[PDB]
Symmetry: D3
Subunit: 256 residues, 6 copies
């Protein structure tokens, strides 16, 4: 098998290409494989808001692996041990929630790097990350292949946006509009004009730093708007929402 | 808890009511619960063409239990031991595949009834079927609350349709049009005009014999047609098909 | 399905009613369902001292859902991310261990409330908590249907009992007598007369502050005593203890 | 580790010792281990009337293995392939349901024996049965260590009792009173005097052949009676029944 | 994704190429993925002599999918329903045990082919076999990509070898030497020459009939000999045996 | 069953005996049981660098229980709640990663000891640790049977080694050479002599302080050297590495 690491999502991101994504919220490897057959550019395996254990995350990575869609993992928290677990199973692209300060962003980067650069403990050689040693010189290869995306979800995070963007090792900053809306005092109302203005300016600021700007837009009109504003890793739906809507729409043909 | 068995699907069937259903093809309890929130009249848990073990079937029954949509279980085949397993976990409505002769139909009914009338093995009192003894006088109550549906899939089954319809203990006869079309020498994609009258005639004969007539129509136009013919337990979609199509439709808004 | 949240356990607690409970310590959905057929008022799904993952907790909630007994979830600890996980799967009543100070109690309440009032991460609409969007206006409904119970386990917690009882958003305070006895320097087997007044006084103080008082009393004599003192969410057994004792009792009839 | 097979249940049976047993009906390895700590002589892992897959059976064998209680496995049916599966995982004592004729009993024995004596296919060398080769000369050792118990549950089976008892390789015959009662036309009424007379005579006949006589008696009075009549592998309860009764009895102290 | 089905194992088989394989006997997807990184030409997922459920088979297919090594599935037996299950999950190459007659071989082929020519149940369109509909015209493409291998492992089967080789749809014939030796009267009391002659002549006959010849040789010398004789799908070890031997050899460096 | 807790690993450790171990990195109970048949003195179930949930750890303990090899559990990190979980399931010997200071070491010890002397949460009586109450006086017996091993693996930790060795409750100190080499400034650009000197002096210091010294050496020559230096809990391979190497070596006999 190939002895080299590669991260296509990261390569595309670095070129500024637009990558269209889908949230995977069922925890199941069965649905992850089905979703992978659609050919989204990326699939966010949501370990934060769906009840995934580390084994469920593993199984969803195995399920999607032969397909073109690239997986991104979100752990329940960006702590050292939880980042350890997902890196060791070979997740190459992480979305880390609740990054509010540059110091927190530096600590997240440190958790992903072996000495001398970070504090990551060895073990990926006997794990999926190095394919049990088939990836040769993993320590030498690993940093360039890891893609780190952080969520800015608070008033505090936005205050520190430029400092966070200056943190070496951060590749992209993601805004989830419903989290930010709640933090700003507009819970469940991300369409509010005040929230929309903050989103628009923030995207331009992120791109100006030479970093990628990410978003989750469950409404297609909002997705198109964020793309126009310069977002380039954009999730355009949540799979369980698309499922329920599709089930409802089919049923409605026979009850109405 | 309630000490009585009930079977709302069976009660509605007996009244000749139309019941609209959805195939559950993922094996997962997670998706079964989500599907149950839609309010289909019935959900077909497909143990024949999806890789369900008996524990997956058990978990899907647990997931859907508090919701209004009624579960129907299809085992991998209608053998005595496989019917035993699904009856003991408390599946009260069965869809039995590949019933080709009246003798097979009689054997299926026998597999659902306790001795001395049938051949069902005794043991419900220590299983979910009798809720571990909370259902009082289970053996006296059970036949009235069990609903048995059989599939006609082949030329042979069509030849024997009248004789099958004369078998006591069968509540409904289901036609999967793709099954019958293949038997008649026509593949899956694009339904086939040549076999439509055979299908319509068969549906009308089932109803004329006083049994419920079932169908799976993944195309809404065909579902409306089979309903007009008199089919009254009609599955109008497969959840994994609705899922994939919805994912494709959402992605197409962002691609070319 | 019903678009409203409800929390019968919380409603009964608010009315001062006595609710009799059972600890579920096996991790298994199979046994949780069997236990639910007994008609305890509540079932404590023990995520702290039994080896439950978040998926085991999910499956136990699915198993008990159609029955009358109400589930209470205890996470491994009351951290922000672990509380997030159990809230998103739709656990509406939490028992939080090791609450030693009023500051800790405030942080626990904050972990259960959305910004800007709290720190709960947003995402219920794509999770079981809001039934994948079927619960309309979840964020408006949620606080009234969430019930928060905290454990006093230590000397420090006792010292801080009055201050904890003044924390808004706590509905009840639970005492595990074995926890407190150990903190006070007394082991598990045979309860200890020396600490009984401390326990009784504490129970009475909780009720006098207008909060519900909880207890686990595995000995029926002690359960009756704590009820007389005013405890009103009282667990009267641990299911694995009742199981082992019943197995032993049956075997003893045949041995010597 | 030890290179020799041993079957303590079989050794005790051959000496005519009375072995007291418990049915395990939850499918769970968690409860199987708890049950094993009681010290029943045997534990019947019920693959027939509880929804066990072959992996659940495996896990329950692993759970009980360090304890003194000896496991007995009942498969869903005594077919060649299902007997293959449970022998390969190292089940040394089988309870085979629905054995109605001597020919069926011979076929069951054949399914358990390698050539020249039976038709069992090789593979146990790379399976748990031979502990992955740590049991040396497995083929030479295996027959003496395998204990086969067959259920007589029909009028037909009782008719053929002496012929079944003459089948080489059958070590014991088990009567389940509720199955036999139903077959005789006394469903749910095994206490009926006619059923009791047949049970008593059958036990004596089994013992007269130098074979062990087995029974499941959920009522202690009936268990003591069958022991008096000469039954020597006697299951005295079902674990889920003892669980539910224990839960009910504890609750009743607080509702009455 | 690609709308054509391909079976690289079958393509190589048709080109007469030698394919070196490994048996996978642990049931685990974790180990299957590790094994796939070694670069065997094929991996036999043993559903007959290891305790695999259909879900374990599904997970092992998902695990190995992105790697070059091609999976071959052996079901518990070659029955209609069990073949149905494994074909629907997308196992394109099957090894069927215990094929003793040409009539049995024709029935196995029939179980793999759609009506009207066979008896395979319709439904792979909403399953992994057709990748949930991404494989267009699945019924038209399928026979060309399905590879059917049968085990001739008894004295009866060898007697019927020419008849079996002439069955349309049989792509290869496998000889498992331990079973054959046992059936020929040499269970493992070594009388080898008769068995070696039979293996050699059988392999040469299979090849002379233009079909692939298969073998499992855990001793490298025997594997080399069968290769020299013309076998072209040869499994050269069992993974759990290689694992135990490697663990033993490492420990021996430190012990006695 | 026996009412006394015993920890053979700790007994041998206290008697200064050399114990040869193997890392278990697959998460699977299937492979754990196979490994246990080899007769290593200890098996390290790696919950830190393999994706084990607490249930996977539980199942691996159940799998290895009847064998002589003693399990050692490494949790994801040595936090209070994570140590609580693994102690309650009956892991009597822990390996704790990333212990860098004496204060950290005292906190780890505290997490393992009951109030009033430590902070371990009460509840092991209804858990596997006390075998559901079969172990009498568990709180009195427990400290003598718990074995605590800590990893000193950073430049900080080695600086604090004498302080850590003096912490009451620490039974052994483990050195993982790859992590230490990285932290000392030699990630795997070979500068070895400094590292070899540090390993040797550290092992000798640990032993001179009357504590056990541990190491993981995947190269047999290095294992032999650490043994010669006085290490007395030495792991001599990682099972998934031995597996991959054995698979590669077998394939190489047939390929290039």
């Amino acid at each position: 098998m190939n002895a080299l690491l590669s991260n296509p999502f990261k390569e595309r991101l670095r070129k500024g290409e637009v990558q269209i994504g889908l949230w995977l919220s069922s925890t199941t490897a069965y649905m992850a494989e089905i979703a992978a057959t659609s050919g989204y550019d990326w699939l966010l395996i949501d370990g934060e808001h769906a009840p995934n254990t580390i084994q469920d995350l593993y199984h969803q990575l195995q399920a999607v692996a032969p397909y073109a869609s690239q997986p991104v993992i979100r752990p329940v928290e960006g702590s050292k041990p939880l980042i350890k677990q997902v890196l060791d199973i070979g997740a190459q692209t992480l979305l880390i929630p609740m990054v509010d300060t540059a110091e927190q962003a530096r600590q997240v980067v440190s958790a992903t790097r072996y000495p001398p650069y970070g504090e990551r403990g060895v073990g990926a050689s006997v794990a999926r990350a190095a394919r049990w040693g088939r990836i040769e010189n993993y320590m030498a290869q690993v940093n360039d292949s890891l893609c780190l995306l952080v969520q800015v979800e608070s008033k505090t995070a936005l205050d520190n946006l430029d400092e966070i963007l200056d943190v070496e090792g951060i590749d992209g900053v993601f805004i989830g509009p419903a989290d930010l809306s709640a933090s700003l005092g507009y819970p469940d109302n991300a369409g509010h004009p005040e929230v929309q203005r903050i989103i628009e300016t923030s995207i331009r600021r992120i791109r100006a730093a030479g970093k990628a700007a990410g978003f989750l837009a469950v409404a297609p009109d909002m997705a198109q708007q964020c793309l126009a504003w310069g977002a380039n890793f954009v999730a355009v739906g949540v799979d369980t929402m698309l499922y329920s809507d599709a089930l409802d729409q089919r049923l409605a043909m026979f009850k109405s």
